[PDB]
Structure 1
């Protein structure tokens, strides 16, 4: 799930294929939209929601075996995974629906913060070594602006 390719276009599209059962669809749509806004705010990239398989970034929730060759591991552990820029499954983001999805403080994992991380990968970013960076390989809930200077540098270096 590591590559050295970026998107050659800036008007990126995404399709929310299916939903998690833990949150209302209006809440999920908004969380994803706000996750994309974080990135489009520090780059010339834009994100448009479409409803066909033609989108660049296809989003889906799955449990265990779900299509590709990297099944999820049930409760906890791996929360999700995304693929680097490119055609087909490339650039897609998958979330493990065996996890309890929520938002803000409290039990469960923030769909908003995890989405922002996955979309980072979907745009070409690799993991960061800075603990407070959003791209750090470990989940950590936080309030306030999610993107660290390190995350902003990495994304602007590509676009």
Structure 2
């Protein structure tokens, strides 16, 4: 047994929005990130805007009351928590970072895809081209490497299709 969601149908909420991107681009980055994981699993995601959700998404800086403060611009870009109640599943993004929906350094969708991988119960990959690689990498299209696919399917199984 290792931290995994008992349910297959999960909920998420964007608590607050970054001023770096328009609301729609933030919504798109998050949705498409969840899409990558739901594509290869029987896992389902639903955005809510009121009340508490399984995966809470937020943009915060420095000390933000979770015992893992951010470090200003650079360094730590974002982090997340393994499946569980309360803070479990939540993903936090450093606001001191400049967030983008393009090649300009620090693509939100690319990072979110990684951090949501943690939200579902994945560890870091050592494969340089894997989404679950801890260092920031961007090569245009962000897609799951076989290591990512095998990791998440080893927990939740294959897609229904």
Rounded Cα–Cα distance in structure 2 between residues aligned with 1:130 and 1:16: 30
- Consecutive unaligned residues of structure 1, counting only runs of 5 or more, are none
Rounded Cα–Cα distance in structure 1 between residues aligned with 2:142 and 2:86: 32
- Consecutive unaligned residues of structure 2, counting only runs of 5 or more, are 157-161
Rounded Cα–Cα distance in structure 2 between residues aligned with 1:81 and 1:34: 18
Aligned residues: 156
- CA offsets 1:100-131 (integer angstroms, 9 cap, x no match): 1002212x200000000000000000001111
Equivalent residue of 1:79, what SS?
strand
> Could you state the TM-score of these two structures normalised by the residue count of structure 2?
0.93
Equivalent residue of 2:76, what SS?
coil
- 1:29 has 2:47 as partner: no
Rounded Cα–Cα distance in structure 2 between residues aligned with 1:4 and 1:100: 34
Provide the aligned C-alpha RMSD in A. Answer: 1.2
Deviation at 1:50?
Answer: 1.1
Deviation at 1:85?
Answer: 0.1
- 1:118 has 2:115 as partner: yes
Rounded Cα–Cα distance in structure 2 between residues aligned with 1:145 and 1:51: 26
Deviation at 1:143?
Answer: 2.1
Q: Which residue of the partner structure matches residue 40 of structure 1?
A: 38
Structure 1 moving runs of 4+ over 6 Å: none
Alignment of 1:43-122 (within 5 A): 43-106=41-104, 108-122=105-119
- CA offsets 1:63-116 (integer angstroms, 9 cap, x no match): 10112111100000000000000000011000000001002212x200000000
**Aligned partner (choices 134, 139, 145) of residue 148 of structure 1:** 145
| 2:11/2:47 contact within 8 Å kept | yes
Q: Which residue of the partner structure matches residue 132 of structure 1?
A: 129
Q: Which residue of the partner structure matches residue 12 of structure 1?
A: 10
